[PDB]
Swiss-Prot record:
Keywords: Disulfide bond, Protease inhibitor, Serine protease inhibitor, Signal. Disulfide bonds join C4-C37, C9-C39, C14-C40, C23-C43, C53-C74, C68-C79. Inhibits proteases from the fungi A.oryzae and R.oryzae, trypsin and chymotrypsin. Does not inhibit protease from the bacterium B.licheniformis or papain. GO terms for molecular function: serine-type endopeptidase inhibitor activity. The chain holds residues 20 to 104 of 105 of the full protein. This is Fungal protease inhibitor-1. The lineage of its organism: Eukaryota, Metazoa, Ecdysozoa, Arthropoda, Hexapoda.
Length: 85
């Protein structure tokens, strides 16, 4: 679990970043998605509630391009409606 301080990616820059111009819909560009602390851009796919998902943790470097559609979270391997409190 490698703390992702505001300047982490300055020390660990994206080495082979994709361009925004390269993502093809329905996939969409995100400036900070892939790699440890999400230093790399990605063309991402969004998943619906209940759909299966792989764990996403940038703190950990586990950064699948297919992610739950915000504010859904991947819990127990399923895109889950979390409502805080």
């Amino acid at each position: 679990d490698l703390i992702c301080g505001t300047n982490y990616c300055k020390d660990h820059p994206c080495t082979s970043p994709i361009a925004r111009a390269s993502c093809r819909s329905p996939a969409t560009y995100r400036a900070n998605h892939s790699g440890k602390c999400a230093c790399c851009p990605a063309c991402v796919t969004l998943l619906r509630e209940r759909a299966a998902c792989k764990t996403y943790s940038k703190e950990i470097g586990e950064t699948p391009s297919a992610v739950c559609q915000e504010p859904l979270k991947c819990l127990n391997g399923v895109c889950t409606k979390v409502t805080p409190r």
